[PDB]
Amino acid sequence: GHMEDTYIEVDLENQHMWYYKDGKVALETDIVSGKPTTPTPAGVFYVWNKEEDATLKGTNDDGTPYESPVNYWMPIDWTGVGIHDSDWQPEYGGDLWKTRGSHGCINTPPSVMKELFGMVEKGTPVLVF
Numbered sequence: 001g002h003m004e005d006t007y008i009e010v011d012l013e014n015q016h017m018w019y020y021k022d023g024k025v026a027l028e029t030d031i032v033s034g035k036p037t038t039p040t041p042a043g044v045f046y047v048w049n050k051e052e053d054a055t056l057k058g059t060n061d062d063g064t065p066y067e068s069p070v071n072y073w074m075p076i077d078w079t080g081v082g083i084h085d086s087d088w089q090p091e092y093g094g095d096l097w098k099t100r101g102s103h104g105c106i107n108t109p110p111s112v113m114k115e116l117f118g119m120v121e122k123g124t125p126v127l128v129f
Helices: 114-120
Strands: 007-011 015-019 025-030 055-059 065-070 072-075 082-085 106-108
Touching: 015 114, 025 114, 072 114, 082 114
Parallel strands: 082 106
Antiparallel strands: 007 015, 015 025, 055 065, 072 082
């Protein structure tokens, strides 16, 4: 519940990523995003690329590059934020990010991210809040 657009959605607080269409959700899963050291931004996001069997990366809180071996990636920012499937990171829900260490990236379930990536492609926004 955040705007009326068709997009993807994410709630950091309740660690839940949706797909909004028709002002309604097409998709909804639990996630884990934005660990305390490198938290998620929240605002108005849009996927500018589709990455499949992709490898996410990033500069840690330290400025140390890392990776996220993903199967479905949908980057929305140029820091390395977006929606992804997280198989290495099998948990999703109430604040996991704090421990589970996602760097602004939203840990969507590999199976549900397939639903999502399955709905959403570039052009579509994403949300986090």
